[PDB]
Amino acid sequence: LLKYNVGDLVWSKVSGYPWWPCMVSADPLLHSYTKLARQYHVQFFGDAPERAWIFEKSLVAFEGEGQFEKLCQESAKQAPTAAEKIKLLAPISGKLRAQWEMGIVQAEEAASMSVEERKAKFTFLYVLHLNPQVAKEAG
Numbered sequence: 001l002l003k004y005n006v007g008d009l010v011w012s013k014v015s016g017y018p019w020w021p022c023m024v025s026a027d028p029l030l031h032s033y034t035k036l037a038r039q040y041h042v043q044f045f046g047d048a049p050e051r052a053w054i055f056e057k058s059l060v061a062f063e064g065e066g067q068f069e070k071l072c073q074e075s076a077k078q079a080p081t082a083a084e085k086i087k088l089l090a091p092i093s094g095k096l097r098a099q100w101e102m103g104i105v106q107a108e109e110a111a112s113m114s115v116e117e118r119k120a121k122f123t124f125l126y127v128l129h130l131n132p133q134v135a136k137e138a139g
């Protein structure tokens with residue numbers, strides 16, 4: 001039923017990290033955004049930009065920050081060991097929490113923008129660099 005496209009907003013669950021706001025985008029070298037068990041190429045929102053391929057089973061549509069609590073809770077049932085379960089919590093403090101909060105601010109802005117608007121603003125530029133307007137607003 002679900003098939004993501006470039007510009008779609010998703011929470012991504014990665015080993016060693018809590019659910020993080022992302023945007024589906026095209027891989028700069030392969031030129032694809034999906035491949036086959038299905039994978040999608042995503043950008044991680046925040047001030048320290050990263051990209052990666054994620055499996056669909058580890059993506060959930062992004063609506064807003066309010067979803068995080070239920071994602072943390074529901075994922076606990078499928079993370080039986082302590083090191084996995086502890087990573088579901090929002091980062092305690094420091095630089096990782098500030099990155100996650102900035103990620104959420106950016107994703108919430110993207111969510112009230114159109115697909116093309118969020119793509120023009122938030123897509124990374126490749127030579128991987130942030131769009132200068134995004135970098136200035138983040139600091």
Ligand SMILES: Cc1ccc(CN2CCCCC2)cc1-c1noc(C)c1-c1ccc2c(c1)OCC(=O)N2
Pocket residue numbers: 014015017018020044045046047048049050051052099100103
């Ligand atoms: C895919 C990936 C690649 C590399 C690095 C390491 N990199 C993190 C940023 C600082 C330098 C070291 C982390 C991930 C990653 N895998 O799962 C999540 C979640 C992340 C991630 C964590 C934090 C941030 C991020 C992605 O991008 C946006 C941001 O501002 N911070």
